[PDB]
Design an enzyme around this catalytic site. Structure first.
Site, PDB file in Angstrom:
ATOM      1  N   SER B 143      -4.570  -3.145   0.477  1.00  0.00           N
ATOM      2  CA  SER B 143      -3.146  -1.563  -0.184  1.00  0.00           C
ATOM      3  C   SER B 143      -2.904  -1.367  -1.052  1.00  0.00           C
ATOM      4  CB  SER B 143      -2.608  -2.144   0.889  1.00  0.00           C
ATOM      5  OG  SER B 143      -2.668  -2.363   2.257  1.00  0.00           O
ATOM      6  N   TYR B 154     -11.745   6.748  -0.216  1.00  0.00           N
ATOM      7  CA  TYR B 154     -10.559   5.676  -0.763  1.00  0.00           C
ATOM      8  C   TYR B 154      -9.989   5.338   0.819  1.00  0.00           C
ATOM      9  CZ  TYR B 154      -6.122   3.982  -1.926  1.00  0.00           C
ATOM     10  OH  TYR B 154      -4.769   3.022  -1.656  1.00  0.00           O
TER      11      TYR B 154
END
Ligand SMILES: C[C@]12CC[C@@H](O)C[C@@H]1CC[C@@H]1[C@@H]2CC[C@]2(C)C(=O)CC[C@@H]12
Ligand SMILES: C[C@]12CC[C@@H](O)C[C@@H]1CC[C@@H]1[C@@H]2CC[C@]2(C)C(=O)CC[C@@H]12
Ligand SMILES: [Cl-]
Ligand SMILES: [Cl-]
Ligand SMILES: [Cl-]
Ligand SMILES: [Cl-]
Ligand SMILES: [Cl-]
Ligand SMILES: [Cl-]
Lengths: 243, 242
Positions: B143, B154
């Site tokens: 994260s 991403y």
């Protein structure tokens, strides 16, 4: 139930062997216009000859899908010589050579170059025309048929990555209201179950290559987003070969 | 419920900023021996100075986690100068240049180099000693807003890093390596996707200190997975270009 793909320009990477080869035969039977890419000229030519026998128009390009520039130069030739790809089948996979400690890292890098990054490059090449025409289909093939222990982590990780690519791209297309570009992912069950929790990842039963392709084609033709299949990764026996 | 990590050698990548920095501080309070890696010397020295202020032994290395050779070179120094890392926190993440000022493709590559391949290189460097001793802990921090050109890379990289965690976890289990633990900080989107989970566009989300609280609690209770809501504002990011 099943859509027609007659006359559609279908591009398949890794078409010179395995699933990619068998997938090309199925599209040939459906009278798609085939563009076949593979790093191996001989395998590529065999696939193409049989596809012609099956009744399809076929064009071939020798392309190393670990090489971004090769992908783009070849895509430029497809667009100029053949037309706009409407179905893109991202199937090419890394092929391992040595297990030896000293030469592993470049092959770990290549695993991601081919199994994941290649999908970015082909999508960048072919999705713009699909979007413009609101007509396309991007097929993420994240199953392949035994991998030595040093490459198991890279290989499996790259499949989670490819499934993530599919899931994210699917939602981007939806967010952008690009309703005519479909996505389909052939996904190993291990992406949902892991390995130890799913004894089939070590024990089978598994599918024959023909069965995998039958399921892939059914999913593509009915525009399913996900197609789960059992892998033939042989997890525990692969790992016991060190213990 | 929680283990002690006193005197453990804890290596944190991306430790010069953000949650890496905040994580270094928490380990400092628990009296771990810190090894901090980051591409930025000043951020690194700032984090180190505060860790020392909190009472911990600290060592720093300027390392480009996109560069496999640099990781290995620096690992060799850690082994020789400090000892065997027992807790590895793979936290470094790619930083983007707007595609107004740079080409996209090298940054898509860099996304995978930093967010995924770096974890292979640090694991190859540090896991052997952990396995030899049957003591270690590998923490996959998956994260960390991203513009439309980089969103696909991403997000895909985070699925990849979670896959790395899950596969590594099962390899260790299969080999009966009971003393090497794994923990993954995982965005909910890896389980839900985006459109099916409105929080991926609307929140609510967590403040960095909350993210770190949950990370530390998971590490210390040796949880395998810690799901958190991401803050990527999926739909608004995309709908902006329409
Ligand atoms: C659809 C859209 C964005 C809308 C329109 O300009 C067409 C392009 C085609 C390429 C797509 C792009 C969105 C971001 C994508 C999906 C990537 O990250 C790689 C290919 C990219
Ligand atoms: C910092 C930033 C903008 C933030 C980030 O995307 C990195 C780039 C790097 C190049 C910079 C740019 C700001 C505008 C600049 C300064 C120009 O006009 C030429 C180079 C440009
Ligand atoms: Cl190929
Ligand atoms: Cl290839
Ligand atoms: Cl499976
Ligand atoms: Cl951060
Ligand atoms: Cl570009
Ligand atoms: Cl999320």
């Amino acid at each position: 139930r099943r859509k027609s793909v007659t006359g559609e320009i279908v591009l398949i990477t890794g078409a010179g062997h395995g699933i990619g080869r068998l997938t090309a035969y199925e599209f040939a039977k459906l009278k798609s216009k085939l563009v076949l890419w593979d790093i191996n000229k001989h395998g590529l030519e065999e696939t193409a000859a049989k596809c012609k026998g099956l009744g399809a128009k076929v064009h071939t390009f020798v392309v190393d899908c670990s090489n971004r520039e090769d992908i783009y130069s070849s895509a430029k030739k497809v667009k100029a010589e053949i037309g706009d790809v409407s179905i893109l089948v991202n199937n090419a996979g890394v092929v391992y050579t040595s297990d030896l400690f000293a030469t592993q890292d470049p092959q770990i890098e290549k695993t991601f170059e081919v199994n994941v990054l290649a999908h970015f490059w082909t999508t960048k090449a072919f999705l713009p025309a699909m979007t413009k025409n609101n007509h396309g289909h991007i097929v993420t093939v994240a199953s392949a048929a035994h991998v030595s222990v040093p490459f198991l982590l890279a290989y499996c990780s790259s499949k989670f990555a490819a499934v993530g690519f599919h899931k994210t791209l699917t939602d981007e297309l939806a967010a952008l209201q690009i309703t005519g570009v479909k996505t389909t992912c052939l996904c190993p069950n291990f992406v949902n179950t892991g390995f130890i929790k799913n004894p089939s990842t070590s024990l089978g039963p598994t599918l024959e290559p023909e069965e995998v392709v039958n399921r892939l084609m059914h999913g593509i033709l009915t525009e399913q987003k996900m197609i789960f299949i059992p892998s033939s990764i042989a997890f525990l026996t692969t790992l016991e070969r060190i213990l």
